[PDB]
């Protein structure tokens, strides 16, 4: 599996993030995170580097060349959907970075290193960066970097943007049904219904149903739906999920005629990941006194201040009679579930979330 490190990191990040946010909606792009963090890693040395490789799961299994090939595959023109991943480096115009770093970051990440005036015009630089990300995401991520995230001491901002727009292989019918948020709350949601031949299974270890909903082309959504807590009902699934347990099923399913009910939903979440990444073991990178980014600058005068991630998803019915029985499988997502969008060719997780609260 040529995207195993990324998936391992994704799951460990999700678990750590769930400590901070145990029940509310949660949405992120592990691919985007991993790409930016690999560019940061390329600059690290010493204990900073060793910790980053551990956290990003590079030691659990040519790193930069693997990112280059995976990105190429993710960016391949298809006709079936829109999918773009783009990296970018913004650097203080008066700073002198290591020539090998700028070269190799361009070579492996295609980051088109650009000078900006953080030293004197930080707020204009913030706006310029935000605007670039807005453009790459077709307006969907308009203000990645919040107020105060950049200042006169900022020297480099490393950025990834991802955008995906797909249509279901089979459209849904737009059908309100009660959604069970927790043992004390139900909220009405607009449901979408499909009856179709689909891959469906059950992961005993996680006590959850798994469904694959294909888009046109080689991208799918997988949904994981518990069938033991008075909260979201996800505690078991979230605590016990692992790469081995998930990958067996995404990459064991048999096709059947399934009646599917899922909510129409839209999420938009913003994270600041320093605390999470420190918790996962990436400590020295964020330590002003200890950080070693000599790969970026031989002066060894840099540290990682913060990591900002913003992700959104909008799920609806859009796709490219007489049946009356109900003997067979149902997948009725009227209570919280996990979901992920998988690039089937690379086996990379592009997006991963928890839908718990309409």
């Amino acid at each position: 599996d040529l995207c195993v490190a990324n998936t391992l990191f994704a799951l460990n990040l999700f678990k750590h993030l769930a400590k901070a946010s145990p029940t509310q909606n949660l949405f992120l792009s592990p691919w985007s995170i991993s790409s930016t963090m690999a560019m940061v890693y390329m600059g690290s040395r010493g204990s900073t580097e060793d910790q980053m490789a551990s956290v990003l799961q590079f030691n659990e299994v040519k790193i930069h060349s693997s990112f280059r090939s995976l990105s190429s595959a993710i960016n391949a023109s298809t006709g079936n959907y829109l999918l773009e991943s783009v990296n970018k480096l913004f650097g203080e115009k008066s700073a002198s970075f290591r020539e090998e770093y700028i070269r190799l970051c361009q070579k492996y990440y295609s980051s088109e290193p650009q000078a900006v005036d953080f030293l004197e015009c930080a707020e204009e630089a913030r706006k310029k960066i935000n605007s670039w990300v807005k453009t790459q995401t077709k307006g969907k991520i308009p203000n990645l970097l919040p107020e105060g995230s950049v200042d006169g001491d900022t020297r480099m901002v490393l950025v990834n943007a991802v955008y995906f727009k797909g249509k279901w292989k089979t459209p849904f019918e737009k059908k309100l049904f009660p959604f069970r948020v927790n043992s004390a709350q139900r909220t009405p949601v607009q449901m979408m219904y499909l009856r179709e031949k689909l891959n469906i299974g059950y992961i005993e270890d996680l006590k959850a149903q798994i469904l694959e909903l294909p888009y046109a082309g080689d991208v799918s959504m997988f949904l994981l739906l518990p069938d033991a807590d008075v909260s979201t009902g996800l505690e078991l699934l979230e605590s016990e999920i692992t790469y081995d347990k998930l990958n067996k099923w995404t990459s064991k399913m048999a096709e059947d005629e399934v009646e599917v009910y899922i909510p129409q939903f839209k999420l938009e979440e913003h994270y600041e990941l320093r605390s999470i990444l420190r918790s996962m073991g990436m400590e020295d990178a964020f330590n002003k006194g200890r950080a070693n980014f000599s790969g970026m600058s031989e002066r060894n005068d840099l540290f990682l201040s913060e990591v900002f991630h913003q992700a959104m998803v909008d799920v609806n019915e859009e796709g490219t009679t007489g049946r009356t029985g109900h003997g067979g499988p149902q997948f009725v997502a009227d209570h919280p579930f996990l979901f992920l969008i998988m690039h089937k060719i690379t086996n990379c997780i592009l997006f991963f979330g928890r839908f718990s609260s309409p």
Binding site: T137, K140, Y215, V307, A311
Partner: peptide, 14 residues
């Protein structure tokens, strides 16, 4: 499905 994301790491001088 429409989905998107951004990621920004900020390097700061010391």
């Amino acid at each position: 499905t429409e989905a998107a994301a951004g990621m920004g790491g900020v390097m700061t001088g010391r």
